[PDB]
């Protein structure tokens, strides 16, 4: 409803390398 | 006093061609 609307992009990231790998493996 | 010696002249490029990077879903 509302609490699930106000947290749409609230996904935690451990580090820059993991973010790099997560955006890299989705395009290769 | 007023003047110092010549600095090392860094030659900037004349015809560089880099790519504008695509946006990423960071």
Task: Please give the method by which this entry was determined.
Answer: cryo-EM
Q: How many C-beta atoms surround the C-beta of residue B26 within 10 A?
A: 9
Contacts of B25 in chain A (CB under 8 A): 23
Report the distance separating Cα B7 and Cα B4, nearest Å.
9
* Nearest CA-CA distance, residue B23 and chain A, Å: 11
Using an 8 Å Cβ cutoff, are A16 and B24 in contact? Answer: no
Task: Give the total residue count for chain B.
Answer: 26
A11: left (phi over 0), alpha (psi -120 to 50) or beta: beta
Q: What are phi and psi of A16, to 5 degrees?
A: -65, -40
A26: left (phi over 0), alpha (psi -120 to 50) or beta: alpha
Report the distance separating Cα B26 and Cα B23, nearest Å.
9
Q: Please give the DSSP secondary-structure letter assigned to residue A28.
A: -
Q: Max Cα separation, chain A?
A: 36
């Amino acid at each position: 409803n509302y609490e699930q609307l106000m947290l749409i992009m609230n996904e935690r990231t451990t580090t820059i390398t993991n973010s790099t790998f997560a955006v890299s493996l989705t395009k290769n | 006093a007023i003047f110092k010696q010549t600095e090392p002249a860094i030659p900037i490029s004349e015809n560089i061609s880099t790519k504008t990077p695509a946006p990423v879903a960071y």
